[PDB]
Write an enzyme that holds these catalytic residues in place. Sequence first.
Site, PDB file in Angstrom:
ATOM      1  N   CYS A  21       0.800  -1.225   0.000  1.00 47.73           N
ATOM      2  CA  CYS A  21       0.000   0.000   0.000  1.00 47.73           C
ATOM      3  C   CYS A  21       0.838   1.282   0.000  1.00 47.73           C
ATOM      4  O   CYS A  21       0.454   2.273  -0.643  1.00 47.73           O
ATOM      5  CB  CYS A  21      -0.957  -0.023   1.173  1.00 47.73           C
ATOM      6  SG  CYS A  21      -0.188  -0.317   2.779  1.00 47.73           S
ATOM      7  N   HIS A  74      -1.554   0.519   7.322  1.00 50.66           N
ATOM      8  CA  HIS A  74      -2.192   0.653   6.018  1.00 50.66           C
ATOM      9  C   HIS A  74      -1.986   2.094   5.557  1.00 50.66           C
ATOM     10  O   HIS A  74      -1.835   2.964   6.375  1.00 50.66           O
ATOM     11  CB  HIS A  74      -3.687   0.317   6.088  1.00 50.66           C
ATOM     12  CG  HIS A  74      -4.345   0.238   4.738  1.00 50.66           C
ATOM     13  ND1 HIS A  74      -3.866  -0.564   3.719  1.00 50.66           N
ATOM     14  CD2 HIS A  74      -5.457   0.850   4.250  1.00 50.66           C
ATOM     15  CE1 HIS A  74      -4.661  -0.443   2.660  1.00 50.66           C
ATOM     16  NE2 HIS A  74      -5.630   0.409   2.960  1.00 50.66           N
ATOM     17  N   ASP A  90      -8.454   4.609  -1.447  1.00 56.00           N
ATOM     18  CA  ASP A  90      -7.925   3.396  -0.861  1.00 56.00           C
ATOM     19  C   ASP A  90      -8.178   2.240  -1.820  1.00 56.00           C
ATOM     20  O   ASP A  90      -9.294   1.730  -1.903  1.00 56.00           O
ATOM     21  CB  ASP A  90      -8.587   3.105   0.503  1.00 56.00           C
ATOM     22  CG  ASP A  90      -8.041   1.838   1.148  1.00 56.00           C
ATOM     23  OD1 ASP A  90      -7.078   1.232   0.586  1.00 56.00           O
ATOM     24  OD2 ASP A  90      -8.564   1.452   2.248  1.00 56.00           O
TER      25      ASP A  90
END
Length: 195
Positions: A21, A74, A90
Amino acid sequence: AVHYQPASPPRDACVYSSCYCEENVWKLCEYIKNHDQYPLEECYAVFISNERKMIPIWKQQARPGDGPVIWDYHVVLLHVSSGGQSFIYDLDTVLPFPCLFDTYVEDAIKSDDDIHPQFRRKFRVICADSYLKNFASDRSHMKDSSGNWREPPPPYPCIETGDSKMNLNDFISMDPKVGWGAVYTLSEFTHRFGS
């Protein structure tokens, strides 16, 4: 602003590797820098983590319908648009891409009030220009003892800078004295960007 045009390509066209990520968000920042739609100054990389590196997030593609997923950290992209409104990008959410900030916080993050304290969420918010200038990862955290890859690394070269080949831990850290950007509690983060 109800006619908001996304700052990124649609989800299926974005650069993406599962469990990278931090890089997926870096590539979104690079896209925005390289286009003339929005000033980069309106955009932030946001690391979500805590001291124990165990943070729940709901509405996640890795476990739809039965959240949360407990991540070590994250990373998402935040865009503060001129129109009165922030949006979260996201690639790993089942919410829309992009998603209104208030919806993402309500449905993906949720309240910390009744969460066991060691799972509560902190947020490191880094201006996108600073993230592109300063971030570096040699991917070494994804290679185990053996030494095999936990998940397949992205095909393009590692992100590095003149000052570092690896400083991921300085972004995952929620120590305000470490790294770049500013660290916020969930309450302070929503106060700053919430509508």
